[PDB]
Amino acid sequence: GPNANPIPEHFFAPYIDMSLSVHKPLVEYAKLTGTKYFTLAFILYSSVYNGPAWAGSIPLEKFVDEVRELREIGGEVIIAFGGAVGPYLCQQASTPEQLAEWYIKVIDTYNATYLDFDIAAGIDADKLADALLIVQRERPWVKFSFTLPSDPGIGLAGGYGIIETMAKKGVRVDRVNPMTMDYYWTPSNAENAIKVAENVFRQLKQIYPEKSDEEIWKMIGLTPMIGVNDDKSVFTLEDAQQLVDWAIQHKIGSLAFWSVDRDHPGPTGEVSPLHRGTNDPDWAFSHVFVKFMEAFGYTFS
Ligand SMILES: CC(=O)N[C@@H]1[C@@H](O)[C@H](O[C@@H]2O[C@H](CO)[C@@H](O[C@@H]3O[C@H](CO)[C@@H](O[C@@H]4O[C@H](CO)[C@@H](O[C@@H]5O[C@H](CO)[C@@H](O)[C@H](O)[C@H]5NC(C)=O)[C@H](O)[C@H]4NC(C)=O)[C@H](O)[C@H]3NC(C)=O)[C@H](O)[C@H]2NC(C)=O)[C@@H](CO)O[C@H]1O
Numbered sequence: 001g002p003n004a005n006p007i008p009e010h011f012f013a014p015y016i017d018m019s020l021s022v023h024k025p026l027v028e029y030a031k032l033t034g035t036k037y038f039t040l041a042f043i044l045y046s047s048v049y050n051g052p053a054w055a056g057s058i059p060l061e062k063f064v065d066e067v068r069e070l071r072e073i074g075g076e077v078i079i080a081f082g083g084a085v086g087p088y089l090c091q092q093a094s095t096p097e098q099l100a101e102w103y104i105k106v107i108d109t110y111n112a113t114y115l116d117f118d119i120a121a122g123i124d125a126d127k128l129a130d131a132l133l134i135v136q137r138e139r140p141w142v143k144f145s146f147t148l149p150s151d152p153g154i155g156l157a158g159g160y161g162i163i164e165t166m167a168k169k170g171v172r173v174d175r176v177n178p179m180t181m182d183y184y185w186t187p188s189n190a191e192n193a194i195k196v197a198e199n200v201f202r203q204l205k206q207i208y209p210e211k212s213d214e215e216i217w218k219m220i221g222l223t224p225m226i227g228v229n230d231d232k233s234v235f236t237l238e239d240a241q242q243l244v245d246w247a248i249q250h251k252i253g254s255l256a257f258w259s260v261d262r263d264h265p266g267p268t269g270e271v272s273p274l275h276r277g278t279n280d281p282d283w284a285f286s287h288v289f290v291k292f293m294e295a296f297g298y299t300f301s
């Protein structure tokens with residue numbers, strides 16, 4: 001389209017924490033990582049602006065030019081709300097109407113075609129669904145992704161109720177993206193990410209029993225935390241390769257990871273937003289995950 005670009009059927013759009021001082025232009029990340037699709041994190045409620053802002057404090061419009069430049073090389077973005085630290089727009093908004101207004105302001109500022117609701121805290125799912133009914137009516141070209149905590153013994157946790165609510169209310173659910181990380185009782189590896197995927201498959205089949213197996217896998221994305229996780233387990237480069245091969249075999253919809261600015265070597269086992277606490281060279285995980293898109297037609301020089 002004039003500005004917005006197509007996202008591939010099978011895509012890799014890793015998270016960038018837009019608020020970090022190390023932040024590079026998106027086009028530069030595209031060159032370094034090999035992917036021209038990113039999930040931009042995170043929009044939160046700012047008291048100062050009484051509305052949406054990066055990290056809940058940085059002007060919403062700050063990155064408009066960067067997105068325009070990425071679109072010049074055929075790239076595209078998913079805008080993410082929420083994450084580990086609040087306050088979320090959906091928590092602060094008093095009505096679904098106010099919430100929808102905020103979401104629509106973000107869509108219109110970025111000409112967004114895909115939003116990601118990264119819900120890792122207690123919320124009022126009914127209010128969210130009511131807001132999203134307004135958003136999809138007013139902006140019917142915008143896809144919705146739900147990124148949620150997960151565990152290999154259960155699949156989605158309370159996040160499952162969010163998807164159940166969406167389905168019942170008639171809110172589009174284009175992507176369900178479990179965060180295959182930080183289990184604390186068992187390590188963040190490929191085997192456990194695959195167990196999460198299988199559990200989420202069963203969960204989505206229970207909500208949408210009319211969907212074919214292929215339709216369910218297409219709805220699923222997986223998002224690990226690269227290298228050292230907060231719980232000290234390590235999602236290794238070997239894990240990355242195993243997960244990518246599994247994801248290709250199952251023709252799932254998407255992969256992402258936390259995070260682009262962490263794809264650098266760092267002191268062993270240290271948790272940082274600026275490196276991954278392993279010795280793999282710069283951009284090593286990015287290059288492995290890009291193979292997921294390459295299997296299905298993607299090329300970028
Ligand atoms: C099933 C279940 O219930 N499982 C839970 C499990 O959820 C719990 O662990 C938590 O898991 C969630 C995912 O479910 C983790 O959140 C993920 O993972 C990312 C890595 O931890 C997380 O990255 C952090 O994001 C912060 C913002 O939200 C970043 O804050 C930044 O801090 C900087 C200063 O240090 C500052 O300069 C920046 O401005 C600031 N950025 C913003 C936007 O405010 C932070 O840097 C970053 N951390 C790192 C190391 O990079 C993401 O938010 C989120 N990922 C995605 C894709 O959304 C969460 O972190 C886990 N918490 C813990 C404590 O492990 C688990 C533990 O409670 O219990 C299980 O049972």
Ligand SMILES: [Mg+2]
Binds near residue numbers: 081090091
């Ligand atoms: Mg929100």
